[PDB]
Amino acid sequence: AMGSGGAHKVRAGGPGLERAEAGVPAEFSIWTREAGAGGLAIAVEGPSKAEISFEDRKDGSCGVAYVVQEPGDYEVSVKFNEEHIPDSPFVVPVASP
Template structure:
């Protein structure tokens, strides 16, 4: 397990990890500047659920929807009939109401839990694949980047059906097209490829 804190100025510092008992840990560090800090906690080089975590050192000033942040894979992509998650950080925003709506090809089942520390977690399950819009509002005003366009695809189990042919491992040239074939072999869902 590893943990580090990123200060508002971008400085990275390792955190102290204390093994409490039976898979429980305490993460300790001393903030050295005011503002929003981010703590990343990883197990086997993968972020644990909810990581990275944001918190504020110092007084909160000038709240509002523009101070709310939302992060997590559930705001980018997800799987059909699986729990997709993201986090919302409201501590900087001051007092107000939070509203979450998910619209798309089918009604999503949404679950919300307040962590009582200025952040909350949201999980949702979509019964059909497609593009969904996740709207997050604070005091009836969209937060930055809301609404989020989220592609919900078939479970990765279907992705195992895909095969690639004609992909050369070497011999490619700069600024020249590289091509290969993807056989879906009956897999359902939207195909997305990135380099």
């Protein structure tokens, strides 16, 4: 475990939390400048395995690119210190190109 912090203070945004395409990296960002010390957990659950990568932009935010291969309805969960951030999980329809 890392932290007992403000998951309620974390914001998220980006197209990857609205829609995605199969085999195409979906991107969004997580704003944690207000939360402080804690761990970030990103899970994408649906009809296929997800490959999730992250990259701290060292400005209070962290960019996240994920790719799923099967079109369908996925849920993107973003948890800070093992608690959901506001509006998590995110329902994301993934379609074909």
